[PDB]
């Protein structure tokens, strides 16, 4: 959300959108489906309902992404009720659809019929460090070097007439 920038414009502009953008993380399909269209004015005045008709079913993808950020073991009852979707097939199916995206990490395993995951979000620290921060070092050094050029050429533009 808005943190460092304080102005009495973006606040009022984001006021109607604040409730729903805060409601994104919650991920409730049924209620918010009606809630959006209820007081919805400007963002639906953007026209042709595009990014919002994408968002409506993007809620479950961001939700299952929140599940990917959540624990491994998936309940047939508890988390199924929490996500308001209860069924053996579509659970693992949509989960697999979240796996094929490549935006997360999971280990597909079937033993007792339950699907687990390694779900390691651990960073590159102490794992192939060189190949990890290589491009970072190269790029940042390039930026700092063109910054050196930026502290080089303008003083010459100062010394050109004198």
């Amino acid at each position: 959300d808005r943190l460092q920038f304080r102005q009495p414009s973006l606040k009022r502009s984001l006021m109607p959108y604040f409730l729903l953008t805060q409601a994104v993380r919650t991920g409730n399909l049924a209620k918010f489906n009606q809630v959006l269209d209820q007081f919805g004015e400007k963002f639906q005045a953007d026209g042709t309902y595009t990014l919002i008709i994408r968002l409506r079913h993007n809620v479950i993808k961001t939700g299952v992404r929140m599940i990917s950020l959540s624990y491994s073991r998936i309940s047939l009852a508890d988390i199924a009720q929490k996500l308001q979707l209860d069924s053996p097939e579509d659970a693992e199916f949509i989960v697999a659809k979240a796996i094929r995206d490549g935006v997360i990490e999971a280990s597909i395993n079937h033993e007792k019929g339950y699907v687990q995951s390694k779900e390691m979000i651990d960073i590159y620290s102490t794992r192939e460090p060189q190949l990890a921060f290589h491009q970072r070092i190269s790029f940042c050094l390039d930026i700092h070097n063109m910054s050196v050029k930026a502290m080089r050429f303008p003083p010459k533009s100062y010394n050109k007439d004198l």
Partner: peptide, 24 residues
């Protein structure tokens, strides 16, 4: 240590750039 050299170089050069980018 190379990264340390990077930070030192960037920071020091950023300090040197002060007088130049003022006077100019």
């Amino acid at each position: 240590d190379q990264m340390v050299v990077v930070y030192l170089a960037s920071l020091i050069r950023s300090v040197v750039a002060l007088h130049n980018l003022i006077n100019n």
